[PDB]
Design a protein around this nucleic acid. Structure first.
Length: 269
DNA sequence: GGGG
């Protein structure tokens, strides 16, 4: 097809558009089915962060992307562009015509590095909504360019801007929902289905949250994650606990991430 | 319907 760059898409023509973009933030797929993402590309990011928004609709959880890592790439077809509150908000009905495909930016897909498998052909999506989606050559280039940029971006910028999350030392004064960015100091198996994450962000605070072993199998001790949509447990006593919801999400960062690398270094037990 |  014809893939438009995020800032070049039309807010004028009634026709669907297609594009490749980097995924920097995402909700888990949930039912109201939806998945909301924050995407960026070379023409749209934080420069002298800024980003476009992507909402995906479907009639079943199985037809939505599960983003476990910031930095991977996505490409959607039959997307409609709307302007929702200042940002560029792209919409895609997976149940109708639209489709999506995820491409790993690192050598391995999250799911993959967990299972020690090698990628098919790395022009091959590690997950797609299609009925068994493929790609034409005109693309290889685009996908290879976005990947290179992706690492140049994540490598020199924080990506997850200092104002996209809330320091933990300000968690208790929060009313409602907020995001976090911390280092997992420990993963503990409480039982058959869930773990207990011991978190510590740059503020130096220690928090805990319960994560379902399967919603987030990538969770690992010593790693940095971004937690989308937590809440402070007003009923907490000895421990300070954050509470995840169904749309909540635990996100890791591709290996080039400056933010992730720095926090692994700065934060410790 | 989208920070749900």
């Amino acid at each position: 097809y014809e893939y438009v760059e995020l800032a070049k898409a039309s807010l004028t023509s009634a026709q669907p558009q297609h594009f490749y973009a980097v995924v920097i933030d995402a909700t888990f797929p949930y039912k109201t089915y939806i998945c909301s993402l924050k995407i960026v590309d070379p023409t749209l990011y934080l420069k002298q962060s800024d980003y476009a928004t992507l909402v995906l609709y479907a009639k079943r959880f199985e037809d939505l992307p599960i983003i476990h890592r910031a930095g991977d790439i996505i490409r959607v077809h039959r997307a409609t562009l709307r302007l929702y509150n200042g940002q560029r908000q792209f919409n895609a009905n997976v149940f109708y015509s639209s489709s999506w495909a995820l491409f790993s930016t690192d050598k391995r897909s999250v799911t993959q590095e967990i299972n020690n498998q090698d990628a098919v052909s790395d022009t091959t999506p590690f997950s797609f909504s299609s009925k068994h989606a493929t790609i034409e050559k005109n693309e290889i280039s685009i996908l290879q360019n976005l990947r290179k940029w992706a690492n140049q971006y994540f490598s020199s910028y924080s990506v997850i801007s200092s104002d996209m999350y809330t320091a933990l030392n300000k968690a208790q004064a929060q009313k409602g929902d907020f995001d976090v960015v911390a280092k997992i100091l420990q993963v503990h198996e409480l039982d058959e289905y869930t773990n207990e994450l011991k978190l510590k962000d740059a503020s130096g605070q220690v928090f805990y949250t319960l994560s379902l072993k399967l919603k987030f199998p990538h969770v690992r001790t010593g790693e940095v994650v971004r937690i989308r949509s937590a809440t402070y447990d007003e009923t907490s006593t000895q421990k300070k606990v954050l509470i995840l919801s169904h749309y909540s999400n635990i996100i890791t960062f591709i290996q080039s991430s400056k933010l992730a690398k720095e926090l692994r270094a700065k934060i410790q037990d």
